[PDB]
Design a protein around this nucleic acid. Structure first.
Lengths: 88, 122, 86, 84, 83
RNA sequence: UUAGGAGCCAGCCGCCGAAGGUGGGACAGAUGAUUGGGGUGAAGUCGUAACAAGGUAGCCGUAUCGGAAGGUGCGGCUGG
RNA sequence: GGUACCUAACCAGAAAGCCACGGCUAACUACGUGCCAGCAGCCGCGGUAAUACGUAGGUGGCAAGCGUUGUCCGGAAUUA
RNA sequence: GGAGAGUUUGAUCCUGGCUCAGGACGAACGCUGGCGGCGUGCCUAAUACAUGCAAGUCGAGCGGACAGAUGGGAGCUUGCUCCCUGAUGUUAGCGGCGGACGGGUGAGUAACACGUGGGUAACCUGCCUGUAAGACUGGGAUAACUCCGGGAAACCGGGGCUAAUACCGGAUGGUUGUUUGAACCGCAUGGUUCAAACAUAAAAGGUGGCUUCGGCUACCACUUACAGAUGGACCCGCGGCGCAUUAGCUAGUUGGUGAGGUAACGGCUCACCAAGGCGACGAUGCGUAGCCGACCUGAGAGGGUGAUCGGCCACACUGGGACUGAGACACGGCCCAGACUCCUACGGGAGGCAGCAGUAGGGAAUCUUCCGCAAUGGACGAAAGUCUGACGGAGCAACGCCGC
């Protein structure tokens, strides 16, 4: 139930996203516990900024993200550092 | 067997609670009225929400009484409260619903909208 | 052309002057239709009483049986003056 | 690994007629959020006396716990000072 | 109404079955308590095992929710301790 | 082992139990003939009570009488 | 959603109003008008020369809005 | 980071009123109005609602139906008709989990509802990880299926057939309870740890591969235990209103003991016994109103408001109860009554828009009966997928700000 996930922000046409550790029972704009950095889809270049260390503490407690959120962690190697900890 | 100066429990949510009689619309002088006869009445009590309120000369139809009703079978219908249902001086009522049972000796005349609104035509 | 040729729930051409709301659609048929009208339906959808009819439309009427009645809001919901004189 | 300390006060006792329990008046006092002067209130509770060693006008401490009955949410600690 | 009719068709069928577990659990306790008004301990010992047979299987099935059943155990158990 | 017991349920029973009915009080609002003052308006009628020693120095409190402002009685006050 | 967008081609062509104008308060004259018609948030304007009414010209205000309206705060140190 | 101005008067100063310039609206109205972003858009009626949609999902839980033709064979008209169970396809019902969240409205509620800080040795937590263990042996049904019966329908009843990760016993288990020991510590209840004894307490298979056909294996699910993660319940100080032309108010009230009851503390319930408790720091009462981060305004101190967006409580036509489920007293679930609507062959039933739209009605006054699951989200499933009026956008009105 505890899904680390995106959070919809910004204007009407061009969205913005914040990567958020929360409960799924709260709504799409619902409350949370603690966040990690950002996401930008409307940039044709990069600038997806992640704290890159804080979620690994939450992943050791166990919080399954959706894959659209998860592959950003693969792009910065959070999960592979975490999989090394699971191989540790 | 309803006379002059009797008090009747009213069987619709048209405004009234208790109704007293004047005269049975028979001939020169008719004493009683069993079922289906038409009385000119007045209103001794009404609901606070009232279309027809306190002190109104009304014309009404007996529905259910503590009288017999000799069918040709020999079956005698006899309720346990004298009553009326207030009508709009015609062969048609003016209330919305009709509380409680209704005697089947109203179908001898054409009061069928009271029959169609009755919940249990006994 | 100063008149609307609208259709009844049979499909008969109802010749009324132009600019009519469906309240004006009632009184050509019968006056008590206006006494018992609640809503209206033109071509599948309900239409508001704020709608003004056009020439060549099928107008169905949501009519109460004998239960309901008018208000003060309808006195300027009569565009056509001959129906407004009704 | 000590657990969290509970609510605690000291105060002064009005009456003793309650069975194995009393009332204790707390006299902390504060300023007002508009003017500034500091006036005193009356704060009284219901406190458990397991030994019934209570006096009218007794200086004593109270200690909260799980609520023992209707409105009783305190037990004593130490009978500090007694009346005359 | 929104195709949740399947709930009520099962909820009543479970309501019969659950109460048979619940009411037999009630009769097991009183029969132990029958051996408290009676002055029999050996009959109370085999009834306590007979009662706790239903009690321990009860939370295994559904809502009896052990923290009640611990009070159901010990209140019966002190009476056998009382004999 | 050809069925009894256990347990179970239909059923009825008891306490609790909403709405309904009955009854005398509470308060809230419309309404009620007539009346009681209170202001508010065009040169209405009646007096002149105040403000000058206002033509009897005013004024507060109480009492009392008259078309009505007021009158005087008694005490008090200077803003006589 | 071929929507944003960009590329090229076309024309002064498509397109401004309401409010104020004695003093508060920036801005005034001419006709009409004669306690009447009418303005008015404030002081108050008109019984024949109305910068205050209504109109016209001309200013001024602000602008895809402008006035009026009801609200709440402020100015109101006028609950301090 | 703090402007004042007209007015009592014949004239002056004070005094004191109101008036005025300013700033906001979820604002409406009058007149006009070209466009583009971004944002709001029933406050009155929590008044009644036509129509469509707003919560389902698993054939890899399961029986059967249901098509199917891989081929096999049959009768011949060469047009077909089949009989076997192909790949695979469909899912009424069954069973698993969700429906308690997502979403709306602001009616009650002046109190631990909320805001803040606390406490729990007085509690709970399916779905999440991680660890510890495991997953033995049987049993009886029953829907669907049909076969009759009764019904206008709503549907209901009876007789057989059958399944499962459905249900129910037997074993073994470090749960828990009892009994008796120890150790340590707190804040009284005590708490924590260790031993022994007794008492019971489970589980389930499915998917694919490998097979010696015994099975094995991963993966999913399952029972139990530990923690963590996770939300929830209960208690407590301290806060934010109006009236004294509301001064007395309460007997389960307030106390104790025991009992029952609740996940849990308790007059929470009941017996008994006691007479207390609440109060001029304003009880009780009454009118009033959802609260808060915040919004607006002010120079600040303060004052007003509590719309949208975000937190939480409360409510789901009005009222009361209750089940299954980790979690409700359940917004689109059941049962009952009250009003009302609809149908009936009068015997009977079905219904709940303050879900999205839209309409009625109210009122000065508030919008489109669109498209899409592409992104975000949830729901279930091993996944594809399915389902989504959450949301995504389009549409309306100068409603407001900014931009041309």
């Amino acid at each position: 139930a505890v899904k680390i996930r995106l959070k919809r922000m910004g204007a009407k046409k061009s969205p913005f996203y914040r990567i958020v550790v929360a409960d799924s029972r709260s709504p799409r704009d619902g409350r949370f516990i603690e966040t990690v950095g950002t996401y930008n889809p409307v940039a044709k270049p990069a600038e997806v900024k992640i704290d890159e260390e804080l979620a690994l503490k939450w992943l050791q407690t166990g919080a399954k993200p959706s894959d659209t959120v998860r592959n950003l962690f693969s792009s910065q190697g959070i999960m592979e550092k975490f999989h090394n900890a699971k191989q540790g | 067997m309803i006379q002059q100066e009797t008090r009747l429990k009213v069987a619709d949510n048209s405004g009234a609670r208790e109704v007293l009689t004047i005269k049975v619309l028979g001939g020169s002088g008719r004493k009683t009225a069993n079922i289906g006869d038409v009385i000119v009445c007045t209103v001794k009590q009404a609901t606070p929400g009232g279309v027809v309120k306190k002190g109104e000369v009304v014309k009404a139809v007996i529905v259910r009484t503590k009288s017999g009703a000799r069918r040709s079978d020999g079956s005698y219908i006899s309720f346990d409260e004298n009553a009326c249902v207030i009508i709009r001086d015609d062969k048609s009522p003016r209330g919305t619903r009709i509380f409680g049972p209704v005697a089947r000796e109203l179908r001898e005349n054409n009061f069928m909208k009271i029959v169609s609104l009755a919940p249990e035509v006994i | 052309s100063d008149m609307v040729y609208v259709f009844t729930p049979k499909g008969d051409v109802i010749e009324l002057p132009s600019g009519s709301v469906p309240i004006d659609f009632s009184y050509r048929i019968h006056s008590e239709i206006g006494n018992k009208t609640i809503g209206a339906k033109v071509n599948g959808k309900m239409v508001t009483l704020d709608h003004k009819l056009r020439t060549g439309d099928i107008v169905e009427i949501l009519t109460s049986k004998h239960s309901y009645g008018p208000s003060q809001d309808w006195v300027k919901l009569a565009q056509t003056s001959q129906a407004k004189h009704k | 690994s000590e657990r969290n300390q509970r609510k605690v006060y000291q105060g002064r006792v009005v009456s003793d007629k309650m069975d194995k329990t009393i009332t204790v008046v707390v006299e902390t006092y504060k300023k007002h959020t508009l003017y500034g002067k500091r006036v005193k209130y009356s704060k009284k509770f219901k406190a458990h006396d397991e030994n019934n060693q209570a006096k009218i006008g007794d200086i004593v401490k109270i200690m909260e716990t799980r609520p023992l009955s209707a409105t009783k949410r305190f037990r004593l600690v130490e009978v500090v000072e007694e009346a005359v | 109404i929104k195709s949740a009719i399947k709930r009520t068709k099962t909820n009543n069928e479970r309501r019969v079955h659950n109460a048979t577990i619940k009411s037999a659990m009630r009769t097991a306790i009183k029969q132990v308590e029958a051996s408290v008004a009676n002055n029999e301990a050996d009959k109370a010992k085999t009834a306590l095992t007979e009662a706790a047979k239903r009690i321990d299987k009860a939370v295994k099935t559904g809502l009896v929710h052990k923290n009640t059943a611990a009070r159901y155990k010990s209140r019966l158990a002190k009476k056998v301790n009382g004999l």
